[PDB]
Curated annotation (Swiss-Prot), chain A:
It is found in: Mitochondrion inner membrane. The keyword Transit peptide applies. The modification N6-acetyllysine is found at residues 14, 30, 81, 107, 144. This is ATP synthase F(1) complex subunit gamma, mitochondrial. The modification N6-succinyllysine is found at residues 24, 81, 107. The chain holds residues 26 to 243 of 298 of the full protein. GO terms for biological process: proton motive force-driven ATP synthesis; proton motive force-driven mitochondrial ATP synthesis. It comes from Bos taurus. The keyword Acetylation applies. GO terms for cellular component: mitochondrial inner membrane; mitochondrion; proton-transporting ATP synthase complex. Component of the ATP synthase complex composed at least of ATP5F1A/subunit alpha, ATP5F1B/subunit beta, ATP5MC1/subunit c (homooctomer), MT-ATP6/subunit a, MT-ATP8/subunit 8, ATP5ME/subunit e, ATP5MF/subunit f, ATP5MG/subunit g, ATP5MK/subunit k, ATP5MJ/subunit j, ATP5F1C/subunit gamma, ATP5F1D/subunit delta, ATP5F1E/subunit epsilon, ATP5PF/subunit F6, ATP5PB/subunit b, ATP5PD/subunit d, ATP5PO/subunit OSCP. It is a peripheral membrane protein. Belongs to the ATPase gamma chain family.
Swiss-Prot record, chain C:
This is ATP synthase F(1) complex subunit alpha, mitochondrial. It is found in: Mitochondrion inner membrane; Cell membrane. Heart muscle (at protein level). Heart and liver. Acetylated on lysine residues. BLOC1S1 is required for acetylation. It comes from the Eukaryota. The modification N6-succinyllysine is found at residues 1, 68, 76, 101, 109. Belongs to the ATPase alpha/beta chains family. The chain holds residues 427 to 553 of 553 of the full protein. Subunit alpha, of the mitochondrial membrane ATP synthase complex (F(1)F(0) ATP synthase or Complex V) that produces ATP from ADP in the presence of a proton gradient across the membrane which is generated by electron transport complexes of the respiratory chain. ATP synthase complex consist of a soluble F(1) head domain - the catalytic core - and a membrane F(1) domain - the membrane proton channel. These two domains are linked by a central stalk rotating inside the F(1) region and a stationary peripheral stalk. The gene is ATP5F1A.
UniProtKB/Swiss-Prot annotation, chain D:
This is ATP synthase F(1) complex catalytic subunit beta, mitochondrial. It comes from the Eukaryota. Keywords: Acetylation, ATP synthesis, ATP-binding, CF(1), Glycoprotein, Hydrogen ion transport, Ion transport, Magnesium, Membrane, Metal-binding, Mitochondrion, Mitochondrion inner membrane, Nucleotide-binding, Phosphoprotein, Transit peptide, Translocase, Transport. Its main location: mitochondrion. It comes from Bos taurus. The chain holds residues 369 to 514 of 528 of the full protein. The modification Phosphoserine is found at residues 47, 65.
Curated annotation (Swiss-Prot), chain H:
The gene is ATP5F1E. Belongs to the eukaryotic ATPase epsilon family. InterPro entries: ATP_synth_F1_esu_mt, ATP_synth_F1_esu_sf_mt. It comes from Bos taurus (Bovine). The lineage of its organism: Eukaryota, Metazoa, Chordata, Craniata, Vertebrata. The modification N6-acetyllysine is found at residues 20, 32. Subunit epsilon, of the mitochondrial membrane ATP synthase complex (F(1)F(0) ATP synthase or Complex V) that produces ATP from ADP in the presence of a proton gradient across the membrane which is generated by electron transport complexes of the respiratory chain. ATP synthase complex consist of a soluble F(1) head domain - the catalytic core - and a membrane F(1) domain - the membrane proton channel. These two domains are linked by a central stalk rotating inside the F(1) region and a stationary peripheral stalk. This is ATP synthase F(1) complex subunit epsilon, mitochondrial. Keywords: Acetylation, ATP synthesis, CF(1), Hydrogen ion transport, Ion transport, Membrane, Mitochondrion, Mitochondrion inner membrane, Transport. It comes from the Eukaryota.
Amino acid sequence: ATLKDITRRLKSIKNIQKITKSMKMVAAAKYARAERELKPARVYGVGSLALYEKADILIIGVSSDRGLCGAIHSSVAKQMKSEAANLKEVKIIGVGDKIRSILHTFKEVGRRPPTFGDASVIALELLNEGSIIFNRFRSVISYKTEEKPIFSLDTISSAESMSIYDDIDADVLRNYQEYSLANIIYYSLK
Amino acid sequence: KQVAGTMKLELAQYREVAAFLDAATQQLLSRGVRLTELLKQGQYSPMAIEEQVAVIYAGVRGYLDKLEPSKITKFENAFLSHVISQHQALLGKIRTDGKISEESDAKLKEIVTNFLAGFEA
Amino acid sequence: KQVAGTMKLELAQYREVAAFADLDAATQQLLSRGVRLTELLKQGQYSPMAIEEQVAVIYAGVRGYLDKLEPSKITKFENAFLSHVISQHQALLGKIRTDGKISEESDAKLKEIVTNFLAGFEA
Amino acid sequence: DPAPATTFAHLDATTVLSRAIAELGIYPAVDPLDSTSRIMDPNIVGSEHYDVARGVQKILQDYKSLQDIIAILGMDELSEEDKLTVSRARKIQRFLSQPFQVAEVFTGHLGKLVPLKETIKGFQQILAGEYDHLPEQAFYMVGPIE
Amino acid sequence: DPAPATTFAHLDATTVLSRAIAELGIYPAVDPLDSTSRIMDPNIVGSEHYDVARGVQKILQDYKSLQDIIAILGMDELSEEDKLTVSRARKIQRFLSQPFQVAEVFTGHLGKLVPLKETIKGFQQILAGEYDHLPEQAFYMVGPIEEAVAKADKLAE
Amino acid sequence: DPAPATTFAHLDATTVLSRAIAELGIYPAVDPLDSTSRIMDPNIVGSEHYDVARGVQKILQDYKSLQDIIAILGMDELSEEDKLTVSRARKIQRFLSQPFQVAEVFTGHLGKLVPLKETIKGFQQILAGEYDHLPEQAFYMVGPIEEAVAKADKLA
Amino acid sequence: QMSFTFASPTQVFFNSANVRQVDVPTQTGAFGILAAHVPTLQVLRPGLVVVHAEDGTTSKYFVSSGSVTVNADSSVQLLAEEAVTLDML
Amino acid sequence: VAYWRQAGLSYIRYSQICAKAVRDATSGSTIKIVKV
């Protein structure tokens, strides 16, 4: 408690504040957009999950690489550890170095707005039962980490309930899964 | 009075967005950092007013915006020796015309752009 | 001195680095040691220790023998270890006290005492 | 501090100049968001004057928010609405600037004495947009709106 | 304080020591941003000595100006250039420490004396990035730079 | 100030009240890290009282220490285990609060007298994690620990 | 009535809309889903999509690929990676 | 079996190409792999 020290601390916290405030403004902005790009993507994604709602049939965590968004990467990490424990044989993925960091893959997430193109790359990487963990946006002030099942096992998708489905060849199906596998990744990212 | 005014304003505009994005503020930062290096000066070598002006001019007209900031001091020293040796005539007019003529403008740009390319060689 | 020689500067560097801290391996080892020597220098009141006993306890930490022990168990290890040495190795303690030093032989002797006792305690 | 603290008990108003404003080129260098009056209210100055003034502080404190985003994210993430608040605001900023008679010895330019009438009027407009096309210069260092 | 503030004008060189530096175990506890000398001039000690000393001051002053943002926004939020300022400054801080012969009763280390050319070289090499791979603790309490390269080997087991 | 400062030496127990604590609505507004007693020794109050009091002080100082580093960035950036120091310390701070018979007009809460053995049990339990699932608010302005539990149900 | 849902990762043309019929380009032929078709699954082919509105004059769309799904409940979902109206090609 | 299968291609890959073709008549890939 010396004039000088206090003085130094006063200007520096003054920088931090200017900086954090703007960072807030950016976030809001990127959130403004994201909010939009999510209206359609949720329709596209729910729509792709319809076959399992209507027909009763790997851990993949999704966040990003950066920021001070704290409870974001923790919740996904929380729910991911929970599962791996409660389970048989596991082989995992995280989208965002952050997932890798919070645990011990992919990077360049959140930084710029995500796309089907990114999803297709994850799907493609994975092909050369699963679950996908991410945060479901509710409010600006709230989100929730849901888990979505990945029956993608082409094998699993050959069951009784699908006897009602007309054409279907073991491989017109292999293509259908692959594609659906890419829509559920896209949807998580958005 | 002419180049100081420009520098005054660009430094003020630099201060406003410093310590940090849009291209317009990338430029405001790039200029401020360069004008800052140009205000550096070693001891025991006070400069004539035309020399000061030739130097400030290089920076406020953007000729050094793409030079690495850490090399500005070496640049300015070599540039100054060069203009004092081969371009005494330009120095005279900067000194004399009482305000940067169209001529000096054309001449300075010629010397600067080409000296700089050599300097970066 | 043989056991406390460079510990003071080490602990001051440890505190700085604990506050500052993908930590590299040297930083990690510096943290693991300082956190443990910190427990070892805790002491209750009214039971000031004989020098040879302080040496035996500090030895345990500065030669690296407790680096994998959980930090919250250090104080209980120390209390059990000291009772054991006082009870069964008086001669060793007398030798450190009387020679005023840790001979080559006292050192080989302490080492097996510590490692074997530690494995038991960890059982 | 005791000196300004004792002095303030006797003041009815303030005029606060600012270096950050002077350095960015506006004179007189008044901070329009920090001057007050123990008595500036519609009952006194009259709705008109009042509204013109108060309408100018909101635009300014509104343009101030958008500054970060404009500099960082780019002066484009602005909605057509917000984009409007900016041009109006920047326009009001300079209309607040004024060439002083006594400043002629400095700038060499003519000075202007602006009647409350001509002042209140010109500021009432801005919001409107009668000058959106009108550039930010027939506004900088001028007297009357005209 | 009036006594020491009035003494400064009588000197040609000053070495200012600091409890905040001592507390970290950095001895001698010299504040590298408040110790001055009348002969620290390129025309007296030469431009290499002069340039290295100013580059050591600059990196130590830049690190000092960031410490309170690191501590609040975390290192990850720092640019890569800012990250190099940090790791290198922290190594330079430790390389300025030194075991003294008269201080062996306090450090537990043998004393060292480092020739002027070895000092210049060691610091120039750290600033240039030649040792970005060695851990910080290697530059702490040693003499010549070769001694830090060897401590890094020792520590690596 | 020289007056209060010279008085400390004349005492066997000190209870230090703090405005900051009072402004957080914690009454009595006792600073749990600046109130001391010459009788807080395990050979006098027994080892269980002594170990629980030392554990409460350690967790509250650990929390105070985290606060200093969270000042700006909240608890998100914090690490789950520290997240556990915070939640517990916060509950302990509230369970130190208590409605006094003479203050009913200000707290709008009937007064409570808590017996020594029960004060120990309740802090012992909180420190052991037995109530990590109750909301903070439940430990505020009550008597014994059974009252925090009730208030928890009531809050649902 | 069948609830039609047509979209791309970015755009949504139909959401649970009561359409009379839809024509889709599949790996095997090109078929018109009717408000009452047996359940089928298919993956698309670069081609044309035609949505017979409730009110005649039918709207067209071009798709590169994706999927189509017809459920026992008359719900239909058409999902294309890229979907542009010929108007912009 | 289609031509591209037997040739190693998958369906996502197929859609990828057709999607793009319609375009030439979003779609970034910032994502980066971290294989270890």
